[PDB]
Scaffold this active site. Structure first.
Site, short mmCIF file in Angstrom:
data_model
loop_
_atom_site.label_atom_id
_atom_site.label_comp_id
_atom_site.label_asym_id
_atom_site.label_seq_id
_atom_site.Cartn_x
_atom_site.Cartn_y
_atom_site.Cartn_z
CD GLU A 12 -3.16 -1.65 2.83
OE1 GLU A 12 -1.96 -0.90 3.55
OE2 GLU A 12 -3.71 -1.32 2.91
CG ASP A 197 -12.28 -7.03 0.23
OD1 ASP A 197 -13.31 -6.83 1.11
OD2 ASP A 197 -11.26 -6.55 0.54
N1 LIG Z 1 -12.80 -6.85 4.07
C1 LIG Z 1 -12.11 -5.97 4.70
N2 LIG Z 1 -11.24 -6.34 6.34
C2 LIG Z 1 -11.02 -5.52 7.23
N3 LIG Z 1 -10.12 -5.04 6.28
C3 LIG Z 1 -10.26 -4.94 4.72
C4 LIG Z 1 -8.94 -4.11 3.79
C5 LIG Z 1 -7.64 -3.27 4.88
N4 LIG Z 1 -7.20 -3.72 4.87
C6 LIG Z 1 -5.95 -4.54 4.29
C7 LIG Z 1 -4.21 -4.89 5.43
C8 LIG Z 1 -5.13 -6.46 5.55
S1 LIG Z 1 -6.01 -7.29 5.97
C9 LIG Z 1 -4.98 -8.74 6.62
C10 LIG Z 1 -3.67 -9.80 5.06
C11 LIG Z 1 -2.97 -9.66 5.86
C12 LIG Z 1 -1.69 -10.07 5.38
C13 LIG Z 1 -1.46 -11.04 3.43
C14 LIG Z 1 -3.52 -10.18 3.49
C15 LIG Z 1 -4.15 -9.88 4.50
C16 LIG Z 1 -5.20 -4.87 6.53
O1 LIG Z 1 -3.91 -3.99 6.85
C17 LIG Z 1 -6.52 -4.45 6.09
C18 LIG Z 1 -9.86 -4.78 3.10
N5 LIG Z 1 -10.36 -5.11 3.29
C19 LIG Z 1 -10.72 -5.83 4.27
#
Ligand SMILES: Nc1ncnc2c(CN3C[C@H](CSCc4ccccc4)[C@@H](O)C3)c[nH]c12
Ligand SMILES: Nc1ncnc2c(CN3C[C@H](CSCc4ccccc4)[C@@H](O)C3)c[nH]c12
Lengths: 232, 234
Positions: A12, A197
């Site tokens: 990001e 998403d």
């Molecule tokens: N559906 C969702 N719920 C909570 N957060 C998010 C987000 C935003 N993020 C994206 C980031 C990754 S969430 C955990 C993760 C860890 C490693 C690889 C992929 C995802 C975290 O900083 C919060 C996008 N979709 C989300």
């Protein structure tokens, strides 16, 4: 004028890091802050890590060591508003914890004691973001963004958010913690994130597929925003 | 004679007894928090009143470490009891601290684990050992084990049942310890949690809390007083 920018993941913050000239790196408390200039505007870009505590720790360090004038939180988000598609922009007018609950003692759902029930994003920052959106022909929604320490994936977790926050436009994991730290230091903030998403049972697949697009969209918006703030 | 012991509690009623005992007390006001500097029976201390919840604790802990650089951190205050043998007033000592409300299991992390963090944060062996010695010497009832944190006050129903299912070994639940542990982990600072039971996190937790917070604050404060003395002078 010095603009602070916070993103959770390397993915990001990396496009933005690449564009920072006269670049230096502060390495502290497990965080990284990249200082220098973004298209001639002084910035300090924090890669915070994921979740509320990581964000709070990072934001505290950024404020204390760099003293930015304002904070922009960028990155991906789970879309909740009906018109949001992957890549689209969400702008906070306000941030609330969706997972905080001291209602047993008469606080509003998502409110913690000593804090406002939600944290209001800065009107001037919001106006500048909306102008950029217009100039770039982006699809965006402005509204309540809710934060928690859970990745939302439909089912009970999504239902709970819909229950307490039917007006929430997006969900993520750092924005409110950042707002909270900013509140305590009287620093204006805005969240400008992009949809990876829609927080449903397909959210893991979508996120893997669309994190790159979300990171690009949010970064392009942030670049435009920094420029607008500094140079009108 | 050159150590500085960091102490963190969330609420005024949890820090007030300790604050009153500080010799040569001064107050640092920063980021919505307060830090009380001075000595406690001769030992240099820095006592943070952080406020409630994970972010308040993290912000507070970060400020305390940055401004005061304590050698170790002791987290004091109340907790909801989960272990069977625990009664109101009894001591809990952390072996470790995990978030009960962190969930990125969708991406293969352990339940409670945040990406970039260990699944749980281990308290310092020496700190725990000394806390256990103070417990023996004070003849108190205590349990040592996992303490879990979240941003919710636990009040029975699904709230409690979920915690007990996800962390069957958890001995207490509260709202700051893991945030503090996480910050300490990132700065390589030893921590221990030494709290006292105010309720059993069930339907009655809110009434029990109002009734027995003072007892919790007293018993935890007594323990921290002995602990500081033990760490400073054996
Ligand atoms: N559906 C969702 N719920 C909570 N957060 C998010 C987000 C935003 N993020 C994206 C980031 C990754 S969430 C955990 C993760 C860890 C490693 C690889 C992929 C995802 C975290 O900083 C919060 C996008 N979709 C989300
Ligand atoms: N059942 C319980 N669940 C979570 N935490 C606790 C605790 C420990 N605390 C006590 C503190 C107060 S809980 C929220 C609150 C807010 C306003 C007034 C009273 C209590 C907070 O720092 C976490 C005791 N019993 C608990």
């Amino acid at each position: 004028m010095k603009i602070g920018i916070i993103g959770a993941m390397e993915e990001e913050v990396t496009l933005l890091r690449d564009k920072i000239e006269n670049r230096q790196t502060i390495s502290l408390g497990g965080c990284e802050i990249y200082t220098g200039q973004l298209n001639g505007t002084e910035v300090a870009l924090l890669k915070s890590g994921i979740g509320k505590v990581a964000a709070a720790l990072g934001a505290t360090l950024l404020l204390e060591h760099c003293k930015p004038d304002v904070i922009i939180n960028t990155g991906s988000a789970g879309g909740l508003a009906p018109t949001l598609k992957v890549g689209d922009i969400v702008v906070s007018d306000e941030a609330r914890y969706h997972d905080a609950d001291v209602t047993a003692f008469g606080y509003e759902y998502g409110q913690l004691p000593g804090c406002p029930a939600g944290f209001k994003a800065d009107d001037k920052l919001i106006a500048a973001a909306e102008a950029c959106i217009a100039e770039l022909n982006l699809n965006a929604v402005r509204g309540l963004i809710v934060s928690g320490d859970a990745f939302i994936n439909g089912s009970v977790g999504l239902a709970k958010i819909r229950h307490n926050f039917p007006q929430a436009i997006a969900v993520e994991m750092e924005a409110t913690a950042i707002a909270h730290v900013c509140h305590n230091f009287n620093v204006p903030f805005v969240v400008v994130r992009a949809i990876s998403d829609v927080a449903d049972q397909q959210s893991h697949l979508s996120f893997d597929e669309f994190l790159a697009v979300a990171a690009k969209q949010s970064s392009l918006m942030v670049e435009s925003l920094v420029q607008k703030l500094a140079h009108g």
